[PDB]
């Protein structure tokens with residue numbers, strides 16, 4: 188799954 | 201004589217796959233007479249060659265600043281590889297060497313808690329929403345606030361403080377007009393750190 | 409030649425009637441060939457003669473540390489008087505002067521809010537009690553904790569942080585065994601600052 192920060196991609200496992 | 205300063209990438213750049221971390225090697229006090237500088241870069245001791253020299257910059261004090269920049273892989277940084285910058289110059293009887301890397305030690309996941317304003321603050325024009333971030337290591341971190349998908353910029357965040365258990369903590373304080381709180385707007389504390397799942401967590405706070 | 413460093417009094421010392429605030433003029437890199445240091449102290453330009461020299465101290469890197477201490481009245485410091493140390497030494501082309509005073513600008517009164525632990529912290533071994541202090545000027549402050557009239561020492565406090573209105577804020581975080589919180593015990597954050605009534609306030613927190 189992924190984390191987004193204000194629309195912007197942080198990281199995915 | 202010339203001196204060297206080696207800077208790490210920004211925490212945010214190492215934590216966001218969508219960004220590009222870099223290490224920066226700065227040679228100040230380069231003389232007009234011998235402006236030529238040689239850079240050798242090493243990653244855990246192996247020489248790498250993909251660095252690029254930034255444009256030379258003349259300084260108000262009749263010296264040049266020379267800067268080499270080396271891009272880095274997020275995981276090389278986060279796995280704690282050591283980056284070495286080696287500077288050589290005619291005014292330098294011996295090459296200067298400098299190293300950096302992520303602070304050494306077991307990464308620990310921040311615990312992120314949101315704290316509503318005190319009932320005693322409710323008299324005031326504006327109120328404080330706090331976000332306590334504790335138990336994190338290393339101390340590289342980013343903390344930002346938002347509401348309804350938009351950045352909330354009226355915040356200040358304390359420097360990381362070394363806690364008695366060897367981790368760090370800090371507080372972030374977001375100040376909002378009291379009517380924005382009374383109106384039930386949901387505000388969120390966003391934390392980026394390497395030891396969080398996907399490097400990211402969000403904790404929300406609203407009128408109860 | 410030597411270098412001079414001039415240090416203020418402890419905020420606590422200027423804020424408690426019982427304590428003796430002092431201002432300290434430290435002279436490092438004093439040579440062995442020329443250990444003699446002349447100190448001249450001025451308070452707002454007026455020379456004073458009551459400073460006292462500390463025992464000279466060998467540093468083992470070929471130099472002495474030579475220190476003069478000037479006692480100050482609480483009101484003189486807080487009224488913003490300027491303290492000048494002038495250092496003369498045979499290794500100086502001329503006397504090094506330094507000055508210190510409290511930081512300038514209307515003092516402002518800390519607003520002191522104790523914040524209980526988050527519900528989400530509640531299944532952990534210990535919990536954090538927060539004493540949030542904001543709106544204070546100058547940044548000189550002291551924060552401590554206690555419970556049932558006994559000191560509570562297991563806390564850490566952030567440095568003061570300059571806020572967008574030009575005042576400062578900090579938080580102090582006390583960690584206590586969860587059980588101690590759950591059982592309704594009262595914990596108290598004590599804050600000393602010039603702009604508080606009696607240079608002192610105490611706020612309490614309990615479940």
Ligand SMILES: *[C@@H]1O[C@H](CO[C@@H]2O[C@@H](C)[C@@H](O)[C@@H](O)[C@@H]2O)[C@@H](O[C@@H]2O[C@H](CO)[C@@H](O[C@@H]3O[C@H](CO[C@H]4O[C@H](CO)[C@@H](O)[C@H](O)[C@@H]4O[C@@H]4O[C@H](CO)[C@@H](O[C@@H]5O[C@H](CO)[C@H](O)[C@H](O)[C@H]5O)[C@H](O)[C@H]4NC(C)=O)[C@@H](O)[C@H](O[C@H]4O[C@H](CO)[C@@H](O)[C@H](O)[C@@H]4O)[C@@H]3O)[C@H](O)[C@H]2NC(C)=O)[C@H](O)[C@H]1NC(C)=O
Pocket residue numbers: 203205207208209210213221222223224226228229259260261263265
């Ligand atoms: C001749 O002039 C030059 C230039 O003088 C400048 O202009 C004049 C008019 C004055 O205003 C000066 O103040 C100006 O600097 C003199 O050069 C200076 O020499 C100093 C030492 O001699 C050196 O001091 C050291 O600074 C370190 C911190 O430097 C930071 O921050 C300062 C200010 O806060 C800033 O000026 C520097 O550029 C540097 O900024 C960082 O740059 C890095 C690299 O770019 C950034 O990181 C990168 O950023 C990019 C994107 O931007 C990306 O994110 C990358 O991922 C990332 O790598 C970073 O963001 C910048 N930070 C900030 C805050 O902006 C100190 O750490 C260091 O301390 C250590 O060493 C000391 C011993 O010397 C110890 O006391 C100490 O404890 C430490 O061990 C030094 O204090 C100055 O940096 C330097 N100025 C410049 C511009 O390089 C020169 O000295 C003078 N010569 C003579 C003979 O008179």
Ligand SMILES: *[C@@H]1O[C@H](CO[C@@H]2O[C@@H](C)[C@@H](O)[C@@H](O)[C@@H]2O)[C@@H](O[C@@H]2O[C@H](CO)[C@@H](O[C@@H]3O[C@H](CO[C@H]4O[C@H](CO)[C@@H](O)[C@H](O)[C@@H]4O[C@@H]4O[C@H](CO)[C@@H](O[C@@H]5O[C@H](CO)[C@H](O)[C@H](O)[C@H]5O)[C@H](O)[C@H]4NC(C)=O)[C@@H](O)[C@H](O[C@H]4O[C@H](CO)[C@@H](O)[C@H](O)[C@@H]4O)[C@@H]3O)[C@H](O)[C@H]2NC(C)=O)[C@H](O)[C@H]1NC(C)=O
Pocket residue numbers: 411413415416417418421429430431432434436437467468469471473
């Ligand atoms: C030979 O050795 C000496 C001694 O050094 C020690 O011994 C050797 C063996 C080494 O092991 C060292 O590591 C040891 O320290 C060297 O002396 C050093 O010189 C430095 C300058 O070259 C100087 O650095 C400057 O320090 C300032 C801060 O000093 C504070 O904090 C330091 C470190 O945290 C501490 O060591 C100092 O003692 C001093 O501590 C404060 O002392 C004051 C006054 O006593 C205390 O205040 C009083 O407290 C009492 C109660 O005790 C009472 O309440 C009074 O009311 C109150 O006044 C205070 O509590 C102490 N504070 C702390 C935190 O502990 C820096 O601010 C300064 O920076 C400034 O200047 C720079 C430009 O000039 C700027 O870059 C900067 O931004 C600032 O403007 C300097 O960095 C060291 O202090 C000094 N060490 C000592 C012990 O004096 C010597 O250099 C060396 N020579 C050679 C040739 O090798």
